[PDB]
Amino acid sequence: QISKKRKFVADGVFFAELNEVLTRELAEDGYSGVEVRVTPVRTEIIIRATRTQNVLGEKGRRIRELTSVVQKRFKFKENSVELYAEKVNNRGLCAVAQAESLRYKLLGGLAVRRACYGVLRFIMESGAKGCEVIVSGKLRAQRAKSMKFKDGYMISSGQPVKEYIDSAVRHILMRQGVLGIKVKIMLDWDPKGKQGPTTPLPDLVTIHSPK
Amino acid sequence: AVESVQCFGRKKTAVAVTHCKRGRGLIKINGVPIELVQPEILRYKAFEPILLLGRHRFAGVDMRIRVKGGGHTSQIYAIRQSIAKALVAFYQKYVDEQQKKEIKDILVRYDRTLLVADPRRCEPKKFGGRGARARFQKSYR
């Protein structure tokens, strides 16, 4: 019975809180994202992840636990909110997945340069137009520094950034401090819209071939 | 079939609408005669479309004007613009195009704002200053 403004703000706050909770819980399991759909007397939450086996657990035990805890914390009515697990299509085109992979590789003791180059190569081979990885913090010395790896196209200004650029930031708790990793992937135009924005770049003009 | 037109004049946020139809030649704003429009100083702007053309051309049309928004000067400017546009439209749609063109030409030769709305609008203010361009006083020590 609340006003529309408060209703929409509460919906946004709930989405943000659920996103943060899912990230914290499924950090290691891999968590590309979450989507919330509202239907009459039913709400569906879809968890996009690279490893759905871990998210579901054995016989859906983990996903059932997550659904129950989410309902209890968010006052949802019994048998009214339900969770699904979904594979992420072209995980290399998701910065969150790539950022988590780089975090895992760095925590595993792998060299920063080798890990970043591998991530860059995987992103490029996954069909990305361009990509960039930044690693900042105390690397090899007590003095913090930044390492930048870049390959391909990239835009940084104007509206097309919001749709053609998918970016993520993550922290790695190393022995001597915190390492900040930033992943930035430039998508490619997709007429279907499944793998990229369904809109061409503003300054791209195509002339049809004359008969 | 009723013989009438409705034309609107604009100035800043002021919107005035003149309903002009066949009649004996009366002109009223919100039910009040145009001769009592306030402020008294701007009565000249209010009457300019009337002084330029003469009362004889208005003798055959009744005009009712409803105004909203804006301020004292903007409302009067919208009133006069709406009056001019309503008279021009009425002459166009019930009177010879020759006379319509003549009245339009005489009005425009005096002032183009009588028929064309001024597009000026208040500029949004930017953080770091009280006004759109004015910035906070800067001190170095």
């Binding site: 529309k4 929409f8 | 770091g128």
Partner: protein, 102 residues
């Protein structure tokens, strides 16, 4: 068995909201029902202006955040069962439907 059914549509996405309104209008028309609307209320612009810096240093720069809410009103002269059947059509996420009488 005829009533003025009031349908309220609220969404943040203008395209989805307009598409849902058009689908409802066409569904009502296909049943030879009388449709009034859609009536588009003034857009609600929730505005928040907060300082960019997480501290008090540097030039005081501010971020203007806006959340736009679009509301539509549709009136149907028909029965509860038929309006319910019409509204049963698929609705994309982000659009809230409310059906009432008067």
């Amino acid at each position: 068995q005829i009533h003025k059914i009031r349908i309220t549509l609220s969404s943040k996405n203008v395209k989805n909201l307009e598409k849902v309104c058009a689908d409802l209008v066409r569904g009502a028309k296909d049943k030879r029902l009388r449709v009034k609307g859609p009536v588009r209320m003034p857009t609600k612009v929730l505005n928040i202006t907060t300082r960019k810096s997480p501290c008090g240093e540097g030039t005081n720069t501010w971020d203007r955040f806006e959340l736009r809410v679009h509301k539509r009103v549709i009136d149907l002269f028909s029965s509860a069962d038929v309006v319910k059947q019409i509204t049963s059509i698929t609705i994309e996420p982000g659009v809230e439907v409310e059906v009432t009488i008067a």
